Design an enzyme around this catalytic site. Structure first.
Site, PDB file in Angstrom:
ATOM      1  N   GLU A 158       0.826  -1.318  -0.165  1.00 36.92           N
ATOM      2  CA  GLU A 158       0.005  -0.025   0.003  1.00 36.92           C
ATOM      3  C   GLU A 158       0.902   1.250  -0.174  1.00 36.92           C
ATOM      4  O   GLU A 158       0.442   2.279   0.526  1.00 36.92           O
ATOM      5  CB  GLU A 158      -0.922  -0.051   1.216  1.00 36.92           C
ATOM      6  CG  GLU A 158      -2.186  -1.144   1.031  1.00 36.92           C
ATOM      7  CD  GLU A 158      -3.045  -1.372   2.125  1.00 36.92           C
ATOM      8  OE1 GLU A 158      -3.047  -0.240   3.207  1.00 36.92           O
ATOM      9  OE2 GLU A 158      -4.058  -2.012   2.287  1.00 36.92           O
ATOM     10  N   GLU A 234      -5.302  -8.384  -1.318  1.00 37.93           N
ATOM     11  CA  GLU A 234      -6.082  -8.157   0.096  1.00 37.93           C
ATOM     12  C   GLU A 234      -7.341  -7.605   0.170  1.00 37.93           C
ATOM     13  O   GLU A 234      -7.712  -6.721  -0.498  1.00 37.93           O
ATOM     14  CB  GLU A 234      -4.880  -7.170   0.651  1.00 37.93           C
ATOM     15  CG  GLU A 234      -5.342  -7.148   2.244  1.00 37.93           C
ATOM     16  CD  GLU A 234      -4.298  -6.225   3.101  1.00 37.93           C
ATOM     17  OE1 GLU A 234      -3.235  -6.339   3.005  1.00 37.93           O
ATOM     18  OE2 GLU A 234      -4.948  -5.517   4.135  1.00 37.93           O
TER      19      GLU A 234
END
Ligand SMILES: *[C@@H]1O[C@H](CO)[C@@H](O[C@@H]2O[C@H](CO)[C@@H](O)[C@H](O)[C@H]2NC(C)=O)[C@H](O)[C@H]1NC(C)=O
Ligand SMILES: *[C@@H]1O[C@H](CO)[C@@H](O[C@@H]2O[C@H](CO)[C@@H](O)[C@H](O)[C@H]2NC(C)=O)[C@H](O)[C@H]1NC(C)=O
Ligand SMILES: *[C@@H]1O[C@H](CO)[C@@H](O[C@@H]2O[C@H](CO)[C@@H](O)[C@H](O)[C@H]2NC(C)=O)[C@H](O)[C@H]1NC(C)=O
Ligand SMILES: *[C@@H]1O[C@H](CO)[C@@H](O)[C@H](O)[C@H]1NC(C)=O
Ligand SMILES: [Ca+2]
EC number: 3.2.1.46
Length: 641
Positions: A158, A234
């Site tokens: 991320e 994810e």
């Protein structure tokens, strides 16, 4: 009305598997000290084929010593020149998964990095070759020390990617004989990775999979155009009650139907971290009491089974998958050997909400659905039926075989809301079962650890959950009384993912505790400027560790002490002078009851009846003023919940 399943017109995309993430961060912390046989039973429910969740993929954090959501995870290189492939529990977890399923697919991804890789900045792209070398050493170690082949490597969880980094990582993998390892990028949003791949042929050649986080079942045009495999790398991250299982059920089908995604990976694998930490109880199952052995095989386990037991990486999706007329969806897959699996989900809005994103309301209602098998599927005459109803519930029950003997290659089902059916030609399905485990029990109200273990099985003492810094068993041959201690080993702030605290800290115990006495032997290694603490009523950790309040009893090597209300030390309850210096062992005691606290130095009262906020509750903790070496020994806590 009539849904046609057919392969005569060809196949859809190849299915790449379902899995889960251990890490980001310390989500498997409390699973390592489960006694047998329970630890083994939990692992079977996750990885054993034809039993429980039967996962195809295991994704792990490559620990970088920073806080990564529910704790820190240790790195294989704490410092320049340091290499150690036996820290933490991810190596262990991967080996336990491969024992159960030799074909499980392994992935690694960094969230944080040791500070030395930044060379004075908090940025991993300052020296591309250096960061690549760090990551590749991990993959090599996996093979050389644990006999693990890592299948996929990611970039930076991320966080921005650097195209030149990705190219250097590929070149570095190849130079080290890891041509076989594939690269997934960029574990963030669809952009900018997706447009970047279309504009840069050299980048496109080195990226094998586009992995997006929490995509809400959708992809974007640039990603479809790239022709890359698209994965939800994810997702999930919801409390594993019936609602979480609904969410999981829905996205497993709809990630492919709506988004062309051929793999979905849940955060996280198992909730083995204190529940009061961020996103508590968001694993496929729950195993957060190694002291009692109590674990819970939660709904999401069986929802997984409806797909994983009846499909394998390398099967193909049919072109004929879709939404049902009255809400819900179906996918169907084959293996090109005559097997067929069909997975039908009718999750209602109100019982399938994910945290990311929240979906506007949609309707589901009772319906009949007729399915007709055309093409190579016409010759199937029998299907096994597996059924789950969520919300008083029935989990993964095997129903009566359905027969398609009439020659119509057709059949109908009565669908209601919040159900899943799997219909498959495969006969290997099983609702795995072990006897119930011991009931739930609070963390022990009296607890001691003297850390006297010469060859520990893991690098850290059970139950201590590091929230900033890294604490490890330590052996000091040059001392007798403190030969075996716990030591904080970071000497500089990591390249952080989260906002780590300015002080290191590890928490332990029962977040419900309100009155407690904590005692520990402590040792400050840094002359003049060093400091350590013990604490109680610590109320926040993980991503929020900076926010922790409680009662903190600090001593410093310049001969002072402070008692603070917060880990940051901004609010003072008391302060004064103490006979305290570096490189000497002291016993600290901290007693908190109702409105009042007291501290002892070597059994003698240093301060007492100091007023502290009440009511309040939380963990016991130990730690250090900055990222500095310090030791701890003979930890004790007596508490009332
Ligand atoms: C990705 O999936 C989409 C559907 O989610 C496919 O796009 C079209 O979808 C419509 C409506 O569902 C179908 O009628 C079309 O047949 C699909 N178009 C094509 C290309 O046939 C699309 O095929 C998928 N894109 C890929 C595989 O790149
Ligand atoms: C359905 O799947 C099963 C399992 O893969 C197939 O059975 C295997 O087939 C392979 C090669 O086709 C054999 O080498 C194995 O010995 C078989 N394994 C098992 C578990 O029996 C089967 O061919 C497929 N077709 C159907 C409809 O059963
Ligand atoms: C923790 O200690 C506090 C203070 O002793 C307890 O609160 C007291 O409990 C007694 C008996 O129940 C009451 O009569 C007092 O009025 C309470 N004092 C205050 C200031 O509230 C508290 O119950 C203890 N908590 C636990 C769970 O042990
Ligand atoms: C959902 O759809 C059914 C069937 O058409 C309808 O009877 C029901 O009122 C709908 N509910 C809402 C709130 O849209
Ligand atoms: Ca000891």
């Amino acid at each position: 009305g009539a849904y046609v399943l057919d392969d005569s017109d060809g196949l859809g995309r190849e299915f790449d598997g379902i899995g889960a993430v251990s890490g980001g961060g310390a989500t498997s912390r409390l699973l390592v000290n489960y006694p047998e046989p329970y630890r083994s039973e939990i692992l079977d429910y996750l990885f054993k084929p034809n039993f429980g969740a039967s996962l195809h993929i295991l994704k792990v954090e490559i620990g970088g010593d920073g806080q990564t959501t529910d704790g820190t995870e240790p790195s294989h290189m704490h410092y320049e020149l340091d290499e150690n492939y036996f820290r933490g529990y991810e190596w262990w977890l991967m080996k336990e998964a491969k024992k159960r399923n030799p074909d499980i697919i392994l992935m690694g991804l960094p969230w944080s990095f040791p500070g030395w890789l930044g060379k004075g900045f908090s940025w991993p792209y300052v020296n591309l070759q250096l960061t690549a070398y760090y990551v590749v050493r991990w993959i090599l170690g996996a093979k050389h020390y644990h006999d693990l082949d890592i299948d996929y490597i990611g970039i930076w969880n991320e966080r921005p990617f650097d195209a030149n980094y990705i190219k250097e990582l590929r070149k570095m993998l190849d130079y080290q004989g890891l041509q076989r390892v594939r690269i997934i990028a960029s574990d963030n949003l669809w952009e900018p990775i997706s447009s970047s791949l279309l504009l840069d042929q050299e980048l496109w050649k080195v990226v094998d999979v586009i992995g997006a986080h929490y995509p809400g079942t959708y992809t974007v045009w640039n990603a479809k155009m790239s022709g890359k495999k698209l994965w939800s790398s994810e997702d999930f991250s919801t409390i594993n009650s019936n609602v979480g299982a609904g969410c999981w059920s829905r996205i497993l089908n709809q990630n492919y139907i709506n988004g062309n995604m051929t793999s979905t990976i849940a955060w996280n694998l198992v909730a083995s971290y204190y529940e009061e930490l961020p996103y508590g109880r968001s694993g496929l199952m729950t195993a957060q009491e190694p002291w009692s052995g109590h674990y819970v095989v939660a709904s999401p386990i069986w929802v997984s089974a409806h797909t994983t037991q009846f499909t394998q990486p390398g099967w193909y999706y049919l072109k004929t998958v879709g939404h049902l007329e009255k809400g819900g969806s179906y996918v169907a897959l084959t293996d090109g050997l005559g097997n067929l699996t069909i997975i039908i989900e009718t999750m209602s809005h109100q019982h399938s909400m994910c945290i990311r994103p929240y979906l506007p309301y949609y309707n589901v209602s009772h319906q009949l659905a007729t399915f007709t098998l055309k093409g190579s599927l016409r010759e199937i005459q029998e299907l096994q039926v597996w059924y789950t109803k969520l919300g008083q519930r029935l989990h993964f029950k095997q129903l009566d075989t359905l027969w398609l003997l009439d020659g119509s290659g057709s059949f109908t089902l009565e669908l209601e809301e919040d159900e899943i059916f799997t219909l498959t030609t495969l006969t290997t399905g099983r609702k795995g079962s072990y006897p119930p485990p011991p009931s739930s029990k609070p963390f022990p109200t009296n607890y001691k650890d003297d850390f006297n273990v010469e060859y520990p099985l893991f690098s850290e003492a059970p139950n201590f959950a590091d929230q900033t810094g890294v604490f490890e068993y330590y052996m000091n041959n040059e001392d007798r009384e403190h030969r075996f201690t716990l030591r904080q080993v970071l000497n500089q702030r990591p390249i952080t993912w989260a906002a780590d605290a300015s002080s290191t800290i590890s928490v332990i115990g029962d977040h419900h505790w309100t009155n407690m006495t904590v005692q520990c032997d402590v040792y400050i290694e840094t002359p003049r400027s060093g400091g350590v603490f013990i604490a109680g009523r610590v109320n926040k950790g993980g991503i929020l560790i900076r926010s922790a309040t409680g009662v903190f009893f600090w001593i410093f090597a310049n001969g002072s002490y402070r008692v603070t209300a917060d880990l940051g030390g901004w609010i003072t309850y008391a302060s004064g002078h103490a006979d305290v210096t570096a490189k000497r062992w002291y016993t600290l005691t901290l007693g908190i009851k109702g409105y009042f606290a007291f501290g002892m130095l070597n059994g003698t009262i240093l301060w007492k009846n100091v007023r502290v906020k009440y009511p309040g509750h939380g963990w016991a903790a130990i730690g250090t003023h900055t990222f500095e070496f310090a030791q701890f020994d003979n930890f004790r806590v007596e508490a009332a919940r």
